[PDB]
Design a protein around this ligand. Structure first.
Ligand SMILES: *C(=O)Cc1ccc(-c2ccc(-c3ccc(CC(*)=O)cc3)s2)cc1
Ligand SMILES: *C(=O)Cc1ccc(-c2ccc(-c3ccc(CC(*)=O)cc3)s2)cc1
Ligand SMILES: *C(=O)Cc1ccc(-c2ccc(-c3ccc(CC(*)=O)cc3)s2)cc1
Ligand SMILES: *C(=O)Cc1ccc(-c2ccc(-c3ccc(CC(*)=O)cc3)s2)cc1
Ligand SMILES: *C(=O)Cc1ccc(-c2ccc(-c3ccc(CC(*)=O)cc3)s2)cc1
Ligand SMILES: *C(=O)Cc1ccc(-c2ccc(-c3ccc(CC(*)=O)cc3)s2)cc1
Ligand SMILES: *C(=O)Cc1ccc(-c2ccc(-c3ccc(CC(*)=O)cc3)s2)cc1
Ligand SMILES: *C(=O)Cc1ccc(-c2ccc(-c3ccc(CC(*)=O)cc3)s2)cc1
Ligand SMILES: *C(=O)Cc1ccc(-c2ccc(-c3ccc(CC(*)=O)cc3)s2)cc1
Ligand SMILES: *C(=O)Cc1ccc(-c2ccc(-c3ccc(CC(*)=O)cc3)s2)cc1
Ligand SMILES: *C(=O)Cc1ccc(-c2ccc(-c3ccc(CC(*)=O)cc3)s2)cc1
Ligand SMILES: *C(=O)Cc1ccc(-c2ccc(-c3ccc(CC(*)=O)cc3)s2)cc1
Ligand SMILES: *C(=O)Cc1ccc(-c2ccc(-c3ccc(CC(*)=O)cc3)s2)cc1
Ligand SMILES: *C(=O)Cc1ccc(-c2ccc(-c3ccc(CC(*)=O)cc3)s2)cc1
Ligand SMILES: *C(=O)Cc1ccc(-c2ccc(-c3ccc(CC(*)=O)cc3)s2)cc1
Ligand SMILES: *C(=O)Cc1ccc(-c2ccc(-c3ccc(CC(*)=O)cc3)s2)cc1
Ligand SMILES: *C(=O)Cc1ccc(-c2ccc(-c3ccc(CC(*)=O)cc3)s2)cc1
Ligand SMILES: *C(=O)Cc1ccc(-c2ccc(-c3ccc(CC(*)=O)cc3)s2)cc1
Ligand SMILES: *C(=O)Cc1ccc(-c2ccc(-c3ccc(CC(*)=O)cc3)s2)cc1
Ligand SMILES: *C(=O)Cc1ccc(-c2ccc(-c3ccc(CC(*)=O)cc3)s2)cc1
Ligand SMILES: *C(=O)Cc1ccc(-c2ccc(-c3ccc(CC(*)=O)cc3)s2)cc1
Ligand SMILES: *C(=O)Cc1ccc(-c2ccc(-c3ccc(CC(*)=O)cc3)s2)cc1
Ligand SMILES: *C(=O)Cc1ccc(-c2ccc(-c3ccc(CC(*)=O)cc3)s2)cc1
Ligand SMILES: *C(=O)Cc1ccc(-c2ccc(-c3ccc(CC(*)=O)cc3)s2)cc1
Ligand SMILES: *C(=O)Cc1ccc(-c2ccc(-c3ccc(CC(*)=O)cc3)s2)cc1
Ligand SMILES: *C(=O)Cc1ccc(-c2ccc(-c3ccc(CC(*)=O)cc3)s2)cc1
Ligand SMILES: *C(=O)Cc1ccc(-c2ccc(-c3ccc(CC(*)=O)cc3)s2)cc1
Lengths: 5, 5, 5, 5, 5, 5, 5, 5, 5, 5, 5, 5, 5, 5, 5, 5, 5, 5, 5, 5
């Protein structure tokens, strides 16, 4: 899981 | 699961 | 998981 | 996991 | 894990 | 892990 | 781990 | 680990 | 580990 | 470890 | 504190 | 604190 | 403190 | 302190 | 202190 | 102190 | 002190 | 003191 | 003192 | 004193 901002 | 903002 | 900003 | 900024 | 900036 | 800037 | 700048 | 600048 | 500058 | 400059 | 996301 | 998302 | 993301 | 990311 | 990333 | 990254 | 990276 | 890297 | 690297 | 590397 990649979190953006 | 990727979270955006 | 890569986090951006 | 690579973190950007 | 490589961290950028 | 290599850190850039 | 190599650190740049 | 080699550090640059 | 070699340090440059 | 060799240090340059 | 207030948070706006 | 207040939050607006 | 306030946070805006 | 305030943080904006 | 304030942080902007 | 303030930090901007 | 302030830091900008 | 201030640091910019 | 200030440092810029 | 200031240092720039
Ligand atoms: C709690 O009872 C022990 C525990 C805690 C955490 C974990 C995890 C294993 C893998 C995790 C993970 C999944 C996805 C992401 C984002 C994208 O890759 C990050 C971390 S948490 C297991 C047991
Ligand atoms: C709790 O009883 C122990 C526990 C805690 C957490 C987990 C997890 C395994 C994988 C997780 C996960 C799924 C999706 C995401 C987002 C996208 O990848 C992140 C993390 S949580 C298992 C047991
Ligand atoms: C807690 O009960 C012990 C514990 C804590 C952390 C972990 C983890 C193993 C792998 C993790 C991880 C997954 C994804 C990411 C982002 C993308 O790679 C980072 C870290 S957390 C297991 C047991
Ligand atoms: C806590 O109960 C003991 C503990 C703490 C940390 C870990 C980890 C093993 C690998 C980790 C990791 C996963 C992904 C990333 C980003 C991309 O590579 C960094 C670190 S945390 C295990 C047990
Ligand atoms: C805590 O209970 C003891 C502990 C602490 C740290 C670790 C780690 C092993 C490997 C780690 C790591 C993973 C990824 C990265 C970024 C990319 O390579 C850095 C460090 S943390 C294990 C047990
Ligand atoms: C803490 O409980 C004892 C401890 C502390 C640190 C470690 C580590 C082993 C390897 C580490 C590492 C992983 C990746 C990187 C970046 C890329 O190579 C640097 C350092 S931390 C184990 C036990
Ligand atoms: C702490 O509990 C004792 C301790 C402290 C440090 C270490 C390390 C072993 C190897 C380390 C390392 C990994 C990667 C890098 C960057 C690229 O090579 C530097 C240093 S830290 C073990 C136990
Ligand atoms: C702390 O508990 C005792 C201690 C301190 C330091 C170490 C280290 C062994 C090797 C280290 C190292 C790894 C990588 C680099 C950069 C590239 O080579 C430099 C130094 S630190 C072990 C135990
Ligand atoms: C601390 O608890 C005692 C201690 C201190 C230092 C060391 C080291 C052994 C080797 C080191 C080293 C690794 C890499 C480099 C750069 C490239 O070669 C320099 C020095 S530190 C062990 C125990
Ligand atoms: C501290 O607890 C006692 C101590 C101090 C220093 C050392 C070292 C052994 C070898 C060292 C070294 C490694 C690499 C380099 C650069 C490239 O060769 C220089 C010096 S420090 C052990 C115990
Ligand atoms: C004993 O009472 C120790 C203690 C614990 C917590 C506090 C605080 C009261 C209010 C605080 C605070 C929250 C948010 C913000 C920013 C958003 O408005 C500032 C201050 S901390 C005092 C003493
Ligand atoms: C006992 O004192 C435990 C404790 C620790 C910390 C706090 C907090 C005081 C203020 C906090 C805060 C305000 C705003 C924000 C920005 C998020 O929107 C983050 C944290 S936490 C209270 C009690
Ligand atoms: C004993 O009473 C320790 C203690 C615990 C909590 C508090 C707080 C009371 C109010 C707080 C607070 C909440 C939110 C905000 C921002 C939103 O309005 C600021 C302050 S913390 C005090 C003492
Ligand atoms: C006992 O003191 C446990 C405790 C810890 C922290 C707090 C909090 C006080 C203020 C908090 C807060 C206000 C606003 C926000 C922004 C979200 O919209 C986040 C946190 S938590 C109370 C009791
Ligand atoms: C005993 O009371 C020790 C103690 C603990 C915490 C505090 C604080 C009260 C308010 C604080 C604070 C929170 C947020 C901000 C920025 C956002 O408004 C500034 C200050 S810390 C005092 C004493
Ligand atoms: C007892 O004193 C434990 C404790 C530690 C730290 C604090 C905090 C006071 C102010 C905090 C804070 C305000 C704003 C922000 C920016 C995020 O949006 C981060 C942290 S934490 C309270 C009690
Ligand atoms: C006994 O009270 C020791 C103690 C602990 C904490 C503090 C602080 C109160 C407020 C602080 C602070 C928080 C955030 C900022 C930047 C954001 O507004 C500045 C100052 S530290 C005092 C005494
Ligand atoms: C007891 O004193 C433990 C303790 C330690 C540190 C603090 C803090 C005071 C101010 C903090 C802070 C403000 C802003 C920021 C920028 C992030 O958005 C980071 C940290 S932490 C309180 C109690
Ligand atoms: C006893 O009280 C020792 C003590 C501990 C902490 C402090 C501080 C109070 C406020 C501080 C501070 C936080 C953030 C900033 C930059 C962001 O605003 C400046 C100053 S440290 C005082 C005494
Ligand atoms: C008891 O005194 C423990 C303690 C140590 C340090 C502090 C801090 C005071 C100011 C801090 C700070 C402000 C801004 C920033 C920039 C990040 O956004 C970093 C650190 S920490 C409080 C209590
Ligand atoms: C007893 O009180 C010893 C003590 C500890 C800490 C301090 C400080 C208070 C404020 C400090 C400071 C924080 C950040 C900055 C730059 C960002 O604003 C400057 C000064 S240190 C005083 C006495
Ligand atoms: C007893 O109080 C000894 C003591 C400890 C610390 C200090 C300081 C207070 C403020 C300092 C400072 C922090 C940051 C900067 C640059 C960023 O603004 C300058 C000065 S040191 C005084 C006395
Ligand atoms: C008793 O108080 C001994 C003592 C300790 C520390 C200091 C200082 C206060 C402020 C200092 C300083 C910090 C940063 C800079 C450059 C960035 O602004 C200059 C001066 S040292 C005084 C007395
Ligand atoms: C008793 O107080 C002995 C003592 C200790 C330290 C100092 C200093 C205060 C400020 C100093 C300083 C820091 C940085 C710079 C360059 C960056 O601004 C110049 C001077 S040393 C005085 C007396
Ligand atoms: C008690 O006096 C111990 C002590 C020793 C030295 C100092 C310093 C004063 C000024 C320092 C300094 C300023 C700038 C730079 C350039 C780096 O960016 C390096 C060192 S150290 C304070 C207290
Ligand atoms: C008793 O106070 C002995 C003592 C110790 C240190 C000092 C100094 C104060 C400021 C100094 C200084 C720091 C950096 C620079 C170059 C960068 O600005 C010049 C001077 S030494 C005085 C008396
Ligand atoms: C008690 O007096 C111990 C002590 C010794 C030396 C100093 C210093 C004063 C000025 C220093 C300095 C300034 C600039 C630079 C260039 C680096 O960027 C190096 C050293 S050290 C303070 C206290």
């Amino acid at each position: 899981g990649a979190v953006e901002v």
